C-alpha cells in the first residue's frame, strides 16, 4: 500500500534551478527519514542528503551543500528538493526514499537534464 | 564516512555463492546495509544492521562483519539476482554508498 511518488522529469539551462517532490503515502510521514539519491549516467548511487518531516531537521553530504537544499510539508505529506545554479553534472537520475529497518520504499526516480 | 567496495564486477555461475566486501575509513559500529539494484527497478534493501535480514528478503543473502570491514553474501545464485549491488553505512545521521558491484551470471 505504501508508496512515493516523484515529481516529473525536469529540463533546465545552465544557472538556473528546479524543485523536485515526492508525497508519500502509505505511513506516518512525520516519524520516519526521507533520503535524496542521485545517479549518474553510468555512476553508482550518490547521497545527496535527509530531512525528518516530523521536525524540519536536514542531513547532508558534504559534496551537496551549497547545491541541493531539502523541505517538507508535513499537511501535504511532500518532501521536495531544490537545486541552485545548475550546472552540466547535474544531468542525473534522482529519487527519493524512506528507507529503514520499517520499510523500504523508493520513488520511480526522475531526470534532470543540464543543456544550453 | 568513505566506503570502499569489492570487487567492482564478477561473473558467476547459477547455484553458486558469490560474496562481496566494503570497506570504510573508520568504525562504522556495524551500521551497514546492503541493496540490491536491478536495472528497470528501484533499489531495494535487503540487509541492515550488517546481518540483519530485511523483512520478506530471501535467506540466500546474507552479511558478516564489524569494525571498518564487511562481507555480503548471495547463496544459490539465481537468475533474478543479476544486478548491481551496494553497500550503505548509515553511522552518524549521514549515508554512504559503496562504489557498487555488478553481478553478471553465467550460463
Ligand atoms: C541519513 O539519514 C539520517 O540518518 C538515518 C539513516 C537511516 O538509514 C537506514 C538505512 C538502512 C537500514 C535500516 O535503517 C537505517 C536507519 O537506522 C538510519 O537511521 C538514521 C538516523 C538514526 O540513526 O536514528
Known amino acids: 500500500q505504501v508508496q512515493l511518488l516523484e515529481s516529473g522529469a525536469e529540463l533546465a539551462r545552465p544557472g538556473a534551478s528546479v524543485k523536485l517532490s515526492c508525497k508519500a503515502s502509505?505511513?506516518?510521514?512525520?516519524?520516519?527519514?526521507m533520503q535524496w539519491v542521485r545517479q549518474r549516467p553510468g555512476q553508482g548511487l550518490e547521497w545527496i542528503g535527509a530531512?525528518?518531516?516530523?521536525?524540519?531537521?536536514?542531513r547532508y553530504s558534504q559534496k551537496f551543500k551549497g547545491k541541493a537544499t531539502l523541505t517538507a510539508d508535513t499537511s501535504s505529506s511532500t518532501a521536495s528538493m531544490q537545486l541552485s545554479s545548475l550546472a552540466s553534472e547535474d544531468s542525473a537520475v534522482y529519487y527519493c526514499?524512506?528507507?529503514?529497518?520499517?520499510?523500504?520504499?523508493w520513488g520511480q526516480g526522475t531526470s534532470v537534464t543540464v543543456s544550453s | 564516512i568513505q566506503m570502499t567496495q569489492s570487487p567492482s564486477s564478477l561473473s558467476a555461475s547459477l547455484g553458486g555463492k558469490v560474496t562481496i566486501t566494503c570497506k570504510a575509513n573508520?568504525?562504522?559500529?556495524?551500521?551497514i546495509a546492503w541493496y540490491q539494484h536491478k536495472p528497470g527497478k528501484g533499489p531495494r534493501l535487503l540487509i541492515y544492521?550488517?546481518?540483519t535480514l530485511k523483512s520478506g528478503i530471501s535467506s540466500r543473502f546474507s552479511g558478516s562483519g564489524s569494525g571498518r570491514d564487511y562481507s555480503f553474501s548471495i547463496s544459490n545464485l539465481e537468475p533474478e539476482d543479476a544486478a548491481t549491488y551496494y553497500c550503505?553505512?548509515?553511522?552518524?545521521?549521514?549515508?554512504?554508498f559503496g562504489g557498487g558491484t555488478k553481478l553478471e551470471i553465467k550460463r
Open positions: 526514499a524512506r528507507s529503514d529497518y520499517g520499510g523500504d520504499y
Open positions: 502509505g505511513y506516518t510521514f512525520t516519524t520516519y527519514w
Open positions: 530531512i525528518y518531516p516530523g521536525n524540519g531537521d536536514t
Open positions: 573508520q568504525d562504522i559500529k556495524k551500521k
Open positions: 544492521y550488517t546481518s
Open positions: 550503505l553505512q548509515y553511522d552518524n545521521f549521514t549515508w554512504t
